[PDB]
Amino acid sequence: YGMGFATNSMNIPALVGKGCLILSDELNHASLVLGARLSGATIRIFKHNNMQSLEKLLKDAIVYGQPRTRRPWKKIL
């Protein structure tokens, strides 16, 4: 692609859409955050390089499911 910013901003929306979950670090670049925002997926932020936080978020996301109607997530990225 012709731009590094456009790579994320334009290809994260294609992979993931509404009903899926995105788990982001605390220190993600602005392109990754913008790409996550443009797609309709839910975004949850775990602490920087804290695999306890990542593991806990994965557990709770798989167990409890979607917030409004507790259904399985289509995908987790």
Partner 1 sequence: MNVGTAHSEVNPNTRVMNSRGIWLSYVLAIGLLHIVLLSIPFVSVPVVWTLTNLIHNMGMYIFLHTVKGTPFETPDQGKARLLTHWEQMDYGVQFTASRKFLTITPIVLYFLTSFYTKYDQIHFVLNTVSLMSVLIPKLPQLHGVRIFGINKY
Partner 2 sequence: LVEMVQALYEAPAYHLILEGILILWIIRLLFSKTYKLQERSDLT
Shortest approach of partner 1 to residue 33 CB, angstroms?
6
Q: In Å, what is the CA distance from 44 to each residue of 1, 21, 39, 51, 57?
A: 28, 8, 14, 14, 8
Beta bridge partners of 23: 44
Residue from 28, 37, 65, 77 binding a second copy (CB under 8 A): 65
Contacts of partner 1 in 38-67 (CB under 8 A): 45
Q: Note the residues at the interface with partner 1 (CB under 8 A).
A: 24-28, 30, 33, 45
Q: Note the residues at the interface with partner 2 (CB under 8 A).
A: 63, 68-69
